[PDB]
Amino acid sequence: MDINGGGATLPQALYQTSGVLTAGFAQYIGVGSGNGKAAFLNNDYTKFQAGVTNKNVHWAGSDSKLSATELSTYASAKQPTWGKLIQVPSVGTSVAIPFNKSGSAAVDLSVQELCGVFSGRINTWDGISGSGRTGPIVVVYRSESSGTTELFTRFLNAKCNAETGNFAVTTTFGTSFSGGLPAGAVAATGSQGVMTALAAGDGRITYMSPDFAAPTLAGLDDATKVARVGKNVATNTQGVSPAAANVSAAIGAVPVPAAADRSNPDAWVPVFGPDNTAGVQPYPTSGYPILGFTNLIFSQCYADATQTTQVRDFFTKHYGASNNNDAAITANAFVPLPTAWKATVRASFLTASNALSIGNTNVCNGIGRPLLEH
Incomplete structure (x- = not known):
């Protein structure tokens, strides 16, 4: 079975660009961020394709941050058997x-x-x-x-x-x-x-x-x-x-999440907001003023080994220093993440020894989102 993703329409043409999603990924289904979050959090494929129940949801695109309630509910209901969810910025956007x-x-x-x-x-x-x-x-x-x-x-x-x-x-x-x-x-x-x-x-x-x-x-x-x-x-x-060139500098200035906060998925998505307010990036004074991030929501763990590898391979490309999706990102009117941002994402979610890494053989031992649907 293919890895199934969907959600936010803002970046749908990006994710539908040939080669952006890697081997094993089904074509992205644009349904809105609300539906994307619900699809992932409840493993409910009907939020992607109405009338279709035979498939699992593996990831979502969302430009809406996971709420405190969404996070707490997933942590209590799903995390013990499916592992921690991962929420990470994908690209910057005006x-x-x-x-x-x-x-x-x-x-x-x-x-x-x-x-x-x-x-x-x-x-x-x-x-x-x-x-x-x-x-x-x-x-x-x-x-x-x-x-x-x-x-x-x-x-x-x-x-x-x-x-x-x-x-x-x-x-x-x-x-x-x-x-x-x-x-x-x-x-x-x-x-x-x-x-x-x-x-x-x-x-x-x-x-x-x-x-x-x-x-x-x-x-x-x-x-x-x-x-x-x-x-x-x-x-x-x-x-x-x-x-994109008019928001690229402002996106580039956004700090990576504080090391101590990285186990909190909320800490990974920067938000813009009012001036002089900690936890919030101020809107830029130069260039174009309206901007933010669109994000990815994945599981740290998949019960299936092939699904795990395929997810890792996507992260390797999308957050790669080389042979990445940056040209496609620019072509779709978006801003690639800075090299240091990519490195920070890889360090937590790819590098094997990290407690947060996708398919971590200790943390994900015997756990993960299910292979079969039921």
Whole structure:
């Protein structure tokens, strides 16, 4: 049986790029981070393929961090027989703001305008300064539990201090703003579903994986289709595009988890958030401001030896110093992890002697996620 993964749609085109997943891996199934987490945590393949129960779930992609409850429940229910779960960043990513409203003038949002658009305070194109555009704004958002929503609401939570209400960090955008959704907002499902909805009506705007926000990488720099963010009219400062190069420095500056915390899966996923707050990376002052990580969730242990080897071989490639996935990562509008980050991941999850290593012959002795489904 193949190793089965799925979840987050933000990186789905990356994981579906030929050669990114290695031998034994089934093609990645994009269903959203909420579904990905549920699939892994409950070993429930129906969260990947509705109506299909005959297979196990081996890993998930998620841009939503595992919650305290998700972690504690897995540790009590599954860890004794399946081993520790592993949660690790896969790549860095911007969050793009694509929109459907024609005009040669560049759409460049100040952070406060972004806040106003997504709170409903600014609901006309005239209300974005220098937009060259008029008429209603319709916000498109993710209907389901979405890691893109989590990455985006982390930014709104950190920055939107001047609304009639505030944004909570959440995976369901419909519940983020305490003052509710903007009138006329449209829900859609998946990264691609949202982009389809974006095109289905004039004047629509959304938040989006940079790999889906434009059909080509250069399209991310087209401010007639993908908004610049970071405008400051008073200081005559232009916003910038969500191209990977505009978040690469900020991603590169994120510290590896503290050694003493590495047995805690929560410690492995850096999150951005408010300024001057320990445990949280501040949003960058230069380049493009909206960014975060998308992550992998695996088991340390698989009952089956072949599955264990195949998982290790994937980690060897994805976190390899050489012969890795970095070119594909860049091609998909994402930021490769720094060399030192890759080394830290390998040291814990690959290097045999480490207590956290996949297939550790002592720690995983007689334990692991099951071969057969039942």
